[PDB]
Write a protein that binds this ligand. Structure first.
Ligand code: LVP
Lengths: 172, 171
């Protein structure tokens, strides 16, 4: 995946977030530090925070990542799109996990009620564990795929099943 | 703490540490001019070649940090393996491959012998991280069975289309 997409993936709370543009940051609601009143020098009052369940979008009043171009964010992707989940792991290792995306689903995962776009990992048969699958630290990592000439971001990692094979992408 | 630390850059491709003393790789990626590997003089390195499968056994522990893993001669037909691809970008690309028959295949001219497989990543990559490239040769094929990781060979070749892969196997 292009170095410009990896540059957007930022360590955030208990996981990650993704810079869509110099002013727009998206992440999984449950990774957000709950008592936080300041982000990248900016007070709460000066940021527009839009929340739909496990999807959260921050719009800043000043450019935080002016090195970046604005890119397309969509509400999930067509069934059967193959996406890459842009996961960073211990030691500047980059893990773009291949996922075939399915239907919008409501599920119960480790007792918690989750809603988003469902997907099945294409890494291996029994992908439980950090080698072929996701870990809780990966939440907020973006789901991306290439169209004609460009890349699209369509959501953020919200959950995975006990088996590891199914993942859920929270969507705008 | 990981399968991925066993995947090592080597010659024109990659290899895999099965134990502290045992390294496996694709024959065609090995340097043809050398007096040592991993600082060990070739003097003291046992080399077992079988077509596109090569095993090295060292006289001392090169990777004492590792436990020994199960190495088998291919896997049962229809096993879904993972090819653990390392790229010079810093990317790790585990791709699912449905394994088939032992066969000889015409793969871009040459005949290659080993266990055939097909990538389960879809039709074509189209410039996404979904297929193998020539530089990936030597990457290991692994699957989980009970609590155990099994390695059953090394990436020897892929078709133009990317669809078909050849896993070179022991013996
Ligand atoms: O075999 C393929 N698909 N179906 C399948 C996958 C796993 C187990 C049983 C199956 F029938 C295949 C080859 C290449 N792309 O899809």
């Amino acid at each position: 995946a292009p170095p410009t997409l990896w540059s957007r993936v930022t360590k955030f709370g208990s996981g990650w977030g993704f810079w869509v543009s110099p002013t727009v940051f998206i992440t999984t609601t449950h990774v957000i530090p709950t008592s936080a009143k300041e982000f990248f020098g900016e007070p709460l009052t000066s940021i527009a925070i839009h929340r739909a369940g496990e999807f959260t979008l921050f719009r800043f009043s000043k450019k935080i990542r002016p090195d970046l171009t604005g890119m397309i964010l969509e509400e999930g992707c067509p069934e059967g799109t193959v996406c890459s989940v842009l996961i960073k792991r211990d030691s500047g290792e980059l893990l773009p996990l291949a996922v075939r995306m399915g239907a919008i689903a409501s599920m119960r995962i480790q007792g918690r009620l989750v809603h988003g776009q469902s997907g099945m990992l294409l890494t291996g048969a029994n992908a439980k564990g950090m080698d072929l699958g996701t870990i809780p630290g990966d939440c907020g990592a973006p789901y991306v795929y290439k169209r004609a000439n460009d890349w699209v971001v369509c959501g953020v990692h919200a959950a995975a099943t006990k088996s590891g094979n199914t993942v859920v992408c929270a969507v705008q």
